[PDB]
Amino acid sequence: PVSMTKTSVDCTMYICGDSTECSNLLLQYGSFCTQLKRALTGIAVEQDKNTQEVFAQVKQIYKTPPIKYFGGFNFSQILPDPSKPSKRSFIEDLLFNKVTLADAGFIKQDLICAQKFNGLTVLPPLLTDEMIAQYTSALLAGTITSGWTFGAGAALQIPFAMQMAYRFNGIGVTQNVLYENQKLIANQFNSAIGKIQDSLSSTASALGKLQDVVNHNAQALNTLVKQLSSKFGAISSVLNDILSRLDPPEAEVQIDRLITGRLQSLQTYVTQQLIRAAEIRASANLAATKMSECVLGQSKRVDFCGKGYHLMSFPQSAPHGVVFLH
Amino acid sequence: KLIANQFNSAIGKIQDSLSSTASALGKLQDVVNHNAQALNTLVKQLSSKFGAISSVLNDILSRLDPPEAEVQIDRLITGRLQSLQTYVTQQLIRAAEIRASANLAATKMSECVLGQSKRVDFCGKGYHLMSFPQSAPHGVVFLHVTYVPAQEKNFTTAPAICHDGKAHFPREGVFVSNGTHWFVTQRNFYEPQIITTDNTFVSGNCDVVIGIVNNTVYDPLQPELD
Amino acid sequence: TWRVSTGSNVFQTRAGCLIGAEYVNNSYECDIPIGAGICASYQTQSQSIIAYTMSLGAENSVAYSNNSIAIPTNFTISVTTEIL
Ligand SMILES: *[C@@H]1O[C@H](CO)[C@@H](O)[C@H](O)[C@H]1NC(C)=O
Ligand SMILES: *[C@@H]1O[C@H](CO)[C@@H](O)[C@H](O)[C@H]1NC(C)=O
Ligand SMILES: *[C@@H]1O[C@H](CO)[C@@H](O)[C@H](O)[C@H]1NC(C)=O
Ligand SMILES: *[C@@H]1O[C@H](CO)[C@@H](O)[C@H](O)[C@H]1NC(C)=O
Ligand SMILES: *[C@@H]1O[C@H](CO)[C@@H](O)[C@H](O)[C@H]1NC(C)=O
């Protein structure tokens, strides 16, 4: 996973609502609201920074030639599918269907209604899915049609079989081994890709680390919303009743407790969000390093780009994250 | 001489860019700005009332008897404690990121300056040659020196050569053709040479590899003898 | 209490409703990000604020073939700066 959800909060609308006495009393508590806003804005911008730094490794948008023959290797299940409007691949479509979101913060002309009516909203990402699909397709086309030369300069073409000979020679096995066993290697690769497709399509349920982010964010928002039903030692949990039954001198005393409780809830929520964003940033940095060192080149680091002697890697996108095929 | 001139020109360009308002040290200014803003907010927070009758302790003491002064002072104490705790927690969170950056910088110093690394895009863009460190207030600047190919040319190529019913492969390089002749060259720099038994090895016959050619292979021993 | 001139250009985006900027069919590098792939800038027409869809990069097609290769014939020395 690379990024998480972007949220914003209206502090006055959450704590007080449409009441004016509550807002006047809240005016005397300093500048907590501004600090909360600044923290959440920082998180929101950091998410876009993560996505951009992960998926923007390519200088130019490369294309694949009209004829698809790469020495017997198929590559059909990972290249873009022109039929679909989004121009995703088969595997990308399976991944998109596997993970279900809640909302991307589009027009909102249940639980989401309660969140909205109390000043909690979600903002959309800066890059749409189509742009990320274009980035992934450009990376894949460059890797297939130019080798590793497009990551250290300008893309230089080379037939795929000779590229595989290079990569074989790079792990201490002579290239005449590949040149004499081309069909067997192609068949094994095609079978492995088909097996991955079949496993993923037959309810693999392997995308849990990407559902956990969505579930945690939704649970945090639901807890924050449900926190409004407490009393914190006051007579009631509704400001209108307090204003109706008590004079202002006592109404202020009763309202201070509610203000303090709501502020404490908001502060704990924001602190937890910061702590989670830290680890999401660390994971995004790891993903960027893997993208730069596994797909743009061949690595001798043990068990870094898969188990065994590394040969190649291909990227795919998924909701809020990336997938590598080593 | 050409490489020396290019290196000097690149260093001069870096100097010129850095001299005239580069403004590239945003990452090192953000830390200072964040710390200053945090301290200023902490000081400004001292003027709040937190639901008391006044924000000044001496005024509260002067205007009320001790029993009421205590209940008026508890609120200020609580609010200021809360502000200080918030400041401390945020400082902890920032220090974590600073430590992560320091660890990354130490690893980069170890692997790019004290050696040559094959990790892609770790010590600069291209193929890594060297790196030099420089200090700066609350940070470090690495100058990465790299080698970039340029001025490519187009050739025809084959995977193996066929001669005397034998398949020959290059020991290190590729076979290239300029239209009528075949040479063997290194991959990163065009430098064609004649194909001989010294720079190729043989394994098998000419009916397994897909895409071989019939070109000739030279042997020095026979001409040397006669 | 302030009112923005609604008779000016109005545009609809997935982020919301944008008033005061005219949508154009050109694509430039993002300057001020609005969201959902939409950015805005201040450009000379007169000068005005415009909104557009950000670009990702120039197209390129590699001339792949069965037996065609490209070999460099010259080199360059690059010196770059990194700040930490
Ligand atoms: C690639 O795989 C798909 C489905 O597995 C198949 O329909 C297609 O024919 C394969 N490619 C070739 C060239 O046979
Ligand atoms: C290819 O190179 C050889 C060098 O031995 C030269 O004699 C020949 O004219 C060249 N052919 C071309 C440039 O078409
Ligand atoms: C040349 O190639 C043909 C077929 O391509 C092959 O039969 C022959 O043995 C090769 N060598 C020669 C003719 O010396
Ligand atoms: C390359 O060789 C394959 C295998 O015979 C052939 O199908 C294809 O038409 C050739 N040309 C290209 C551009 O792939
Ligand atoms: C390589 O590029 C340099 C650029 O400084 C140029 O001076 C030199 O002549 C070039 N070499 C060749 C063989 O063209």
Side-chain angles (χ1 to χ4, degrees), chain B residues 56-67:
Chain B
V56 190
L57 227 52
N58 293 97
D59 184 67
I60 294 171
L61 271 302
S62 179
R63 288 166 60 181
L64 293 167
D65 51 83

Side-chain angles (χ1 to χ4, degrees), chain B residues 6 14 139-148 150-151 153-155 157 190, chain C residues 66-84:
Chain B
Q6 293 187 16
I14 279 177
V140 59
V141 176
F142 296 104
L143 311 173
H144 302 307
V145 183
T146 60
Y147 164 101
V148 184
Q151 297 185 3
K153 260 289 291 183
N154 211 36
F155 301 93
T157 179
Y190 184 65
Chain C
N66 275 328
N67 60 339
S68 183
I69 200 170
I71 305 289
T73 64
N74 206 336
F75 56 82
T76 305
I77 307 298
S78 293
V79 188
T80 62
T81 69
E82 178 169 359
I83 298 153
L84 282 156

Side-chain angles (χ1 to χ4, degrees), chain A residues 139-204:
Chain A
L139 279 159
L140 201 105
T143 298
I144 293 170
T145 194
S146 64
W148 55 43
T149 52
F150 84 112
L156 306 178
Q157 64 273 13
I158 183 180
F160 193 89
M162 300 183 61
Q163 169 179 351
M164 259 295 176
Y166 287 7
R167 295 179 179 271
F168 256 61
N169 192 266
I171 61 171
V173 186
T174 48
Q175 56 193 348
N176 70 287
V177 169
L178 173 110
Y179 285 137
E180 299 170 354
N181 291 316
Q182 200 174 334
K183 298 186 181 64
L184 182 65
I185 295 167
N187 291 333
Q188 290 179 349
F189 171 87
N190 299 330
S191 301
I193 282 288
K195 203 185 298 181
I196 291 287
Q197 170 180 349
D198 288 321
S199 170
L200 207 59
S201 180
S202 294
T203 64

Side-chain angles (χ1 to χ4, degrees), chain B residues 162-165 206 212-215:
Chain B
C162 181
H163 189 238
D164 291 1
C206 302
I212 62 187
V213 288
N214 265 22
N215 192 260

Side-chain angles (χ1 to χ4, degrees), chain A residues 81 93 116 126 212 294:
Chain A
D81 197 329
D93 281 355
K116 284 174 56 277
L126 177 58
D212 293 1
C294 302

